[PDB]
Design a protein around this ligand. Structure first.
Ligand code: FHR
Lengths: 296, 296
């Protein structure tokens, strides 16, 4: 049971390089618009107290160099939506897939296509952590790399990287420029809050273990939502909600293990450990598969 | 320091669906040849003792249905090279990338594009295990999916999946149809040998941890090569060879830590565990980064 990223080809055809002054980063080219973090227009002096609308006012199209591989794309307009810069360009991207912009919630998963200076380097699967950060690519120049899900050849773009936080994780926005988490695109002291394990995803992963014949951790016991959350808080797991219980419904129907039965298994695992056993392949409980990921 | 798969777009444009009778799986369309596992010509009565020369001589070109998306490719020739079938087709793939065929060795890494009925479903990075199998979440219908590296826009194809072993891992061939390991394309009792940890890769990754500022696991000890292997084999670690020591040389010189000194650290990590700590972000000794990967 490997974590898999989505095939990245549809996104690879959209990655471009965007340069403003001395700063170069990645941009996303869909139709005749290139999207990228607005902080590309900032010099170091601006980064401490940026006035973004005024800085964009002082910029012209000729300040923006956009290159899609060998071809330079002529910028013919520029505007801002929240924290995302929108560069209108000469030419519509002939490789634009069917796509949508969506905003995801903490705990949901997606693939990141790590890019350096407009060229894709690698792809990985991750989850939006409860503290609204993403485990880092650890690749310089990754600003502007995007996160996405693919559903029947429609690409749902959900993330763009704006920053690396001191712990290596990155922070960023949706494609409408709205930050995930309490972070700002200014040079200031910012840090990831204390993170928690995504409980509903661990439960999904235990159901995957059961579907794949790994059942030693099942027991006769059951728990209540409130009793579980008391243990959850103790081991810094996200509280489980009734909505979480409901989305696990199809897995509970498929396996015969009610969610509160599996919560009893998880509670025992947290309080007593694994006794040298493994689940699927791991001595560690995995939390970067959603219920949806497990069904599919 | 995330494990990443290569961007898969160059391989996605080569994946097709190959059908022979009732049997459907994945093929690789490069230039005017489609490569796929030869057991596509097996019926249900053929799995236990297939006679491939006899099964193939009875086929004509029109017995092979090849579908590239919504387009049928016309097969105009067919032949067998070891365990891989080669279908010559009407049309050279216009999306053929620069490519080579390479045979890899246990411990080397590559990306797998997992596919179902010719359509890419996900991508992941892995290592060829010492027992010549791949730990892969491989759906029904993933036969014919391929493994690859990408270097300077050249795709090196090293692997094609042929079957699942009873323990959930898969086995396959190079693109000349020669199996990795002692496996055969026959439904027999064949099982993966005991898997071992890839020692040289763990050591390379500990060097990467030192380079990125982790040092907590270092100690004041050294070891002889023979004493290390005597201990490491008690944890199901692969033995370290003088070739492996030579390969680690550049990282030794970069860090100022002798190879046998790092080996002493590994010995202590196996004895002590991590004690709640992390190395490059993980709670596990990672063995799927090669020295080449790390030096890069
Ligand atoms: C964007 O591509 C680069 C990516 C890496 C990280 C730093 N240098 C690189 O090549 N990231 C940046 O350019 C941002 C710019 C931000 C400035 C502050 C807030 C808005 C955008 N810088 C960082 O991501 C950054 C700087 C920094 C300094 C000290 C600790 C952490 C840290 N992260």
């Amino acid at each position: 049971f490997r974590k898999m990223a989505f095939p990245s080809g549809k996104v690879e055809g959209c990655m471009v390089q965007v340069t403003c002054g001395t700063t170069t980063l990645n941009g996303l080219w869909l139709d005749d618009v290139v999207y990228c973090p607005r902080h590309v227009i900032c010099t170091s002096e601006d980064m401490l107290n940026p006035n973004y609308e005024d800085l964009l006012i002082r910029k012209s199209n000729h300040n923006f160099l956009v290159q899609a591989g060998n071809v330079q794309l002529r910028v013919i307009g520029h505007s801002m939506q929240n924290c995302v810069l929108k560069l209108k360009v000469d030419t519509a991207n002939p490789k634009t897939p069917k796509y949508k912009f969506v905003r995801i919630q903490p705990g949901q998963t997606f693939s990141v296509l790590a890019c350096y200076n407009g060229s894709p380097s690698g792809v990985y699967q991750c989850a939006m952590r409860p503290n609204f950060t993403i485990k880092g690519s650890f690749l310089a120049g990754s600003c502007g790399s995007v996160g996405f899900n693919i559903d029947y050849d429609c690409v749902s773009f959900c993330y763009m990287a704006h920053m690396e936080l001191p712990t290596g994780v990155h922070a960023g926005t949706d494609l409408e420029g709205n930050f995930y988490g309490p972070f700002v695109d200014r040079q200031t002291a910012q840090a990831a809050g204390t993170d928690t394990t995504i409980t509903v995803n661990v439960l999904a992963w235990l159901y995957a273990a059961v579907i794949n014949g790994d059942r030693w951790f099942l027991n006769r016991f059951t728990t209540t939502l409130n009793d579980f959350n008391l243990v959850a808080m103790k081991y810094n797991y996200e509280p489980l909600t009734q909505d979480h219980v409901d989305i696990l419904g199809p897995l509970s129907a498929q396996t015969g293990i009610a969610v509160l039965d599996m919560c009893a298994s998880l509670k025992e695992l947290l309080q007593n450990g694994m006794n040298g056993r493994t689940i699927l392949g791991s001595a560690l409980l995995e939390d970067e598969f959603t219920p949806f990921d497990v069904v599919r």
